Amino acid sequence: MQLNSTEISELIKQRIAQFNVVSEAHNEGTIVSVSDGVIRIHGLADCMQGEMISLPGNRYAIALNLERDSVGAVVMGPYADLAEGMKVKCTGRILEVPVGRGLLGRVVNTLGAPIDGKGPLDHDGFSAVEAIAPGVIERQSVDQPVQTGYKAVDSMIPIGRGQRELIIGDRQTGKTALAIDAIINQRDSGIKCIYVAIGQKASTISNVVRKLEEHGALANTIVVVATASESAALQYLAPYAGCAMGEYFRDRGEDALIIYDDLSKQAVAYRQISLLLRRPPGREAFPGDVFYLHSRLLERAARVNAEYVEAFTKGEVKGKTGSLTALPIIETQAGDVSAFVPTNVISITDGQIFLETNLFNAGIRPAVNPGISVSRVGGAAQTKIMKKLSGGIRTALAQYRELAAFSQFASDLDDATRKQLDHGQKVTELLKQKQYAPMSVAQQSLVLFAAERGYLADVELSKIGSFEAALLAYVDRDHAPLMQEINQTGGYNDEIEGKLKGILDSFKATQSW
């Protein structure tokens, strides 16, 4: 399909024919200094703070300091080949990014340029990266479920559309796995997905993209990439580009979910860019406004009322309420939640899914820690059946954990607690599942029903993964008409209670694990 070199010739001829011969005035400055990624520019009297300055080589710098006689800008890309005396041009643009459905399902960097190798984007218009969040009166309460597909999170820690949930934990405890499984689970909801990776090594992004397209979720998500080796300016500004790309959907009355991978690395990149500009430091050398770094980001994750979207879209949409859901990830060191950036982001978000390392190493995966993890939006964002089934699980598990801590010193122990310390040990063995296996509300619901109404009390040998798999296969064969009702309505009734009793009774009596 390439022998037709007339195709090459016609491409080149079209590019020549449509070259424009006239020239236009532009404002120009000279590079006076360059070091560690920062350049000083002389000239550009009309440069404006936050503007994009175009360097020779089709790359940009962001004018951060407008000093009295020079402009201090940070290069977005490889700076080492710049040299004093080169000339730069001022674009009339405050930092932009492309937005729209057209980049939905494509891999791009912080500037919206496609690193995917599949041609140019088809955006509609551009959005300012550093925007402002909706006001107090333009917002709405969050009472719509978003399902992460994980029994532990969807039952104990419900997430709502417009909520901000912190995924916090030590290194290598399944944070990225939980995040991209929450993405994959949105294959077929109305929620669009966005994954921003900050400081990730390129092999992790390659694996993430392969898994996203393998499980069929790539067509429904935007991937924004600032790898571990790219200039700190690109890593510091990546989550704002991702937030603008998701806020495009928010403002049109649709639902988006955005995952910031290692905000605790955006803070490090901002610390670097700040110290290289000689700005005064604060508690751990992080600049003074590091709180105002994450705050003005996570306050853009909001659910917005119908009047706001109606007025923004100039009346083209009437009944919809838009929303953007944020799942920032934070890495702690030896689980000291009380560190500086973790205790800031915990003061910003509306909950945290604390992932405990000693549960993760013990094979409990996902290693969510009950008690210390909460959702302050809570049951308002939980479908009715899940809310009914899950009410006890969290406190039952926390008290099971403390009782099983006591147990090690107390052999020959009361036969009443002997049963609590076994039901807890079965529920904690039930709420752990394979990695890329998201589970619908019905499959979680009837499993939690089996566990809560005592049907597990005779499987007290821990052959209980096979029990779950066989129960799901059985229900998927016979009673698919009930799973459809549960998945469509999420409702719960005494009639559905009886139907589930019937399913469990018929399963116990007639099948094997």
Partner: protein, 460 residues
């Protein structure tokens, strides 16, 4: 023709003034005559008009203001290829082994971009080290990274010597060793161990010694990376040994403090994580070849929480944990089997047999660590008869995963042994299942394959 003139000298930091036409760009290499010696400078910053701020690679003594400086219009670039095998070189690619010139044929700049995520090759081919405990408890694939964490005196350097030997005369692939922040005694011991063991002809050695200016110690990692990348482009599966990442971060701290940058959380440089990323992101497998790597990491004052070990953790795929307690009990290699981990240790990539053997070993050792204090208090004759068997099997496991190294011979005189992964799994899987409950414990100490255990017991 030379066009630059020195205008300041403050320690290792030199300022050079050029015509405003010809200002060298960042990381370019300048050259000057420090008397009869030839000194190269690396441009760190283009501060001010025409002036350039640089770090001297050699020592700065004897420099004077107004000397003429000649700018090489390319970064520091080193020889690469077959010609560098068996040689010792400094950061500038000059031979420090007195065997004459390198015989170079091509030169590569040590600064280059990392492979893009589209060029990477997803791979899961496990390496087979000759070491039982590392093969079992912490497998790692081609293109992956392994960190030998531990204090001082636990065996990181000799473990890397053993790996170099085993992957140079069992699997015949090339290897590169970048001794950043090397101790000259240890570097000479390494050279003589590799020359005595016949493996020297398949190892390329770069040394930046501790008595050299900070940036000279800093750029050695990139020099070794560039040699490994040249071997990669030839299609080889190269293996890169970094002798201590902690001294690379210390050299970065020193050079950042000399340039007067504002320091960071613990006095470390602000660019710590970007230097670590620019180092570790070039070490990857690609569709043409691969660079695997093992890195020694010294943990200062025994905490995994300060910026250096904390920032290197983000890049490793396998972590081996060495302990001086286990070493003082006379067990080598002193790997802690419970705290060492790998991302590739799951049934899907190692197979269910390997995974089950590893998890069973860890479970047995954990149960023994539990029983140890009931034994201490109540004596052993009180344990239940299945616990008196867990004790013996854990005690035999704890012996069997020690091993005699070929390079440790000069410490012990006994010969080394290379153990295939099949024999390792067969041995541990046999011990846990009671096939050897009739042998003494000392039949497993410092043996190779289980056949040597049965033969030693037969001799014992």
């Amino acid at each position: 023709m030379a066009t630059g003139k020195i205008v300041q000298v403050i320690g290792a930091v030199v300022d050079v003034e050029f015509p405003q036409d010809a200002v060298p760009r960042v990381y370019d290499a300048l050259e000057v005559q420090n008397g009869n010696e030839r000194l190269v400078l690396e441009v760190q910053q283009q501060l001010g008009g025409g002036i350039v701020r640089t770090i001297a690679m050699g020592s700065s003594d004897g420099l004077r203001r107004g000397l003429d400086v000649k700018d090489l219009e390319h970064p520091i670039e080193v020889p690469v290829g077959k010609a560098t095998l068996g040689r010792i070189m400094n950061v500038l690619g000059e031979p420090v082994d007195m065997k004459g010139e390198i015989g170079e044929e091509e030169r590569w700049a040590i600064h280059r971009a990392a492979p893009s995520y589209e060029e990477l090759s997803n791979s899961q081919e496990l390496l087979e080290t000759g070491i039982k405990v590392i093969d079992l408890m912490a497998p790692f694939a081609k293109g992956g990274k392994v960190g030998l964490f531990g204090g001082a005196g636990v065996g990181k350097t000799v473990n890397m010597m053993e790996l170099i030997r085993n992957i140079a005369i069992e699997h015949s692939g090339y290897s590169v060793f970048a001794g950043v922040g090397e101790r000259t005694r240890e570097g000479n011991d390494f050279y003589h161990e590799m020359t005595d063991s016949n493996v020297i002809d398949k190892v390329s050695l770069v040394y930046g010694q501790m008595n050299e200016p900070p940036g000279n110690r800093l750029r050695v990692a990139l020099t070794g990376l560039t040699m490994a990348e040249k071997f990669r482009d030839e299609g080889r599966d190269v293996l890169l040994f970094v002798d201590n990442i902690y001294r690379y971060t210390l050299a970065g701290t020193e050079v950042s403090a000399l340039l007067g940058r504002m320091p960071s959380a613990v006095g470390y440089q602000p660019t710590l994580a970007e230097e670590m990323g620019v180092l570790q992101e070039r070490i990857t497998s690609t569709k043409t070849g691969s660079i695997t790597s093992v890195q020694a990491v010294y943990v200062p004052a025994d905490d995994l929480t300060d910026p250096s070990p904390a920032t290197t953790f983000a890049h490793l795929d396998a972590t081996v944990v060495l302990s001086r307690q286990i070493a003082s009990l006379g067990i080598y290699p002193a790997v802690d089997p419970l705290d060492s981990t790998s991302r590739q240790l799951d049934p899907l990539v190692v197979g269910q047999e390997h995974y089950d053997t590893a998890r069973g070993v860890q479970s047995i050792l954990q149960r023994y660590q539990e029983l140890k204090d009931i034994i201490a208090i109540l004596g052993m004759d009180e344990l239940s008869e299945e616990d008196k068997l867990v004790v013996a099997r854990a005690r035999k496991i704890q012996r069997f995963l020690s091993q005699p190294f070929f390079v440790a011979e000069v410490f012990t005189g006994s010969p080394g042994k290379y153990v295939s992964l099949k024999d390792t799994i067969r041995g541990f899987k046999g011990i846990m299942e009671g096939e050897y409950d009739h042998l003494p414990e000392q039949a497993f100490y410092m043996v190779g394959s289980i056949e040597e255990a049965v033969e030693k017991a037969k001799k014992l």
